[PDB]
C-alpha cells in the first residue's frame, strides 16, 4: 500500500504540469474571446458616434 498510494502522488506531481499549461491556454483564450472582441466593439462606437 505504500507503493499503491505513491501512484496517486506521481499522478498529482504530473497534474501540476498539466494545469501549468492550462493557465497559459486560458490566457490566450481570453485574448481571443474577451480582450480582442471588446476592442472591436469599442471601435464601432467611436465610428457610429461620428
Amino acid at each position: 500500500r505504500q507503493e499503491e498510494i505513491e501512484i496517486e502522488v506521481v499522478q498529482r506531481k504530473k497534474q501540476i504540469a498539466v494545469e501549468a499549461q492550462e493557465i497559459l491556454r486560458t490566457d490566450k483564450e481570453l485574448i481571443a474571446t474577451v480582450r480582442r472582441p471588446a476592442e472591436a466593439e469599442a471601435h464601432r462606437i467611436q465610428q457610429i458616434a461620428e
Binding site: 507503493e3 506521481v10 504530473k14 497534474q15 491556454r25
Partner: protein, 53 residues
C-alpha cells in the same frame, strides 16, 4: 518420540509459511512498482497534448 517430531515440524512450518507468504505477495508489489512508472507517462501525454493546444 511423537513430541520430539511434532515440535520440529511446527518450527519448520513457521519458516515455510513465512517464506510462502512472502513469495505469494511478491507479485503485486512489483505490479505496483511497474504501474508507478507507467502512470507517470500516461499523464505525461496530457502535458504534451495541452502544450500543442
Amino acid at each position: 518420540a511423537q513430541r520430539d517430531y511434532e515440535l520440529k515440524k511446527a518450527a519448520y512450518d513457521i519458516e515455510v509459511n513465512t517464506r510462502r507468504a512472502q513469495a505469494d505477495l511478491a507479485y503485486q508489489l512489483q505490479v505496483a512498482k511497474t504501474k508507478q512508472q507507467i502512470e507517470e507517462q500516461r499523464v505525461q501525454v496530457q502535458v504534451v497534448e495541452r502544450a500543442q493546444q
